[PDB]
Amino acid sequence: ANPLYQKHIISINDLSRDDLNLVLATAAKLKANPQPELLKHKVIASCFFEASTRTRLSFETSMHRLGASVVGFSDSANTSLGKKGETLADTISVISTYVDAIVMRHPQEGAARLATEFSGNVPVLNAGDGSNQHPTQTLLDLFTIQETQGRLDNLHVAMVGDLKYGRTVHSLTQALAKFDGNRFYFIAPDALAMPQYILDMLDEKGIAWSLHSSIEEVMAEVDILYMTRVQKERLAPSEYANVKAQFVLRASDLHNAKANMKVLHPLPRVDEIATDVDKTPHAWYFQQAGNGIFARQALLALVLNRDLVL
């Protein structure tokens, strides 16, 4: 009777606060003593309708490391929906009669929400539906902050970079606000402003935000800094003006940077981040990267087993 059981993975604002804790409990237990069998037989279409390195692979590794047999597509072409002109619907509609779960990713907004109307019993998980959401990065970010930083409440994070499109933050951002104790500081271009549909929230949610145009400003402040790659392929030919990195973190920026504070990038880093910094202490984007295995594994298990694990 596990909670997330048979449940679907789609938008963090479809859950709550107390809801998370469950996978995380699952997760901290695996980073410890695992179970290479726990999800045998199981078949998961790892169909990705858009590019990706870390969200797909890691996920297959989160599946392979548990015993679940998988066969999904990397490129949304050599499939009937490709040159055959088949609608996602049918495409899902049928794939759902072959696998016990679909862990997709799709170039358009909420194409995930699509799946479920043609899924039902069969669990559907999203690796980001257009700039919209990516409920799945928020979780690995979730493991980090809580891991590298004791408590999960009473803290402040500096979300900087393409926000208008960062499937990433929307999720995470909206996630945190729900917790008792988390101030928000958004640093973004004039255009790439963090979509409102998240702004208003904190407000009512008593959670307070503020916009700044410096890295040093909230230097000694923010317990954590979330940088973002710029949704370059995800852009209308107007917003294209503020294309490049209006913000590119460096070394010396780490002067009055708080000890426990670290840099977190859901990768890949395009120009926003320097390589010399990987040597530094905060350098954790990378460590904030290998978390998925754990986050996605914990997560995978759950939905795939009514009974709690170990």
Binding site: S11, N13, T87, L88, A89, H106, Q108, E109, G110, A111, R113, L114, E117, D129, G130, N132, Q133, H170, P195, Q196, Y197, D200
Partner: protein, 146 residues
């Protein structure tokens, strides 16, 4: 003043020039059974208004609330057999599905055989909707093909 109906529904009090729209947008034409739309007419309770009187046609409460946004204050004199029998309000509903046309081009709410559906909620001086598919919440105005 139109006349006097037999059995069906009637929308006493409809914002001027708004009765044409709540009709033209909707298939209140598709319906063959006789319709006497009184666009622009005297109010009495109010000053000016519009009064619909679609007969044989019955609207329980889904197509009732959907008017909250449009005609704020209105009335359903649900006259069944020459006698008025209606007590329903155009409440703001959860979410009005299959009707509007999404603003977010990239959203996946049209490009597929799927229908549409935006969540209703009251923001500030104005109302603003969120398309469930792509979690986006555009203003109750921008949601059209203009």
């Amino acid at each position: 003043q139109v006349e006097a109906i037999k059995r069906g529904t009637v929308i006493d009090h409809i914002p001027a020039q708004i009765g044409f729209k709540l009709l033209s947008l909707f298939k209140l034409t598709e319906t063959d059974q006789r319709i006497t739309i009184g666009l622009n007419l005297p109010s009495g309770e109010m000053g000016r208004k519009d009064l619909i009187k679609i007969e044989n046609t019955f609207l329980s409460e889904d197509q009732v609330d959907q008017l909250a946004l449009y005609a704020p204050q209105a009335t359903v004199n649900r006259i069944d057999n020459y006698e008025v029998v209606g007590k329903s309000r155009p409440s703001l509903p959860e979410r009005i599905d299959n009707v509007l046309v999404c603003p977010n081009s990239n959203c996946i709410s049209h490009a597929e055989p799927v229908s549409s559906s935006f969540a209703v909620r009251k923001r500030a001086n104005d109302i603003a909707l969120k398309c469930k598919y792509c979690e986006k919440e555009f203003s109750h105005n921008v949601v059209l093909a203009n």
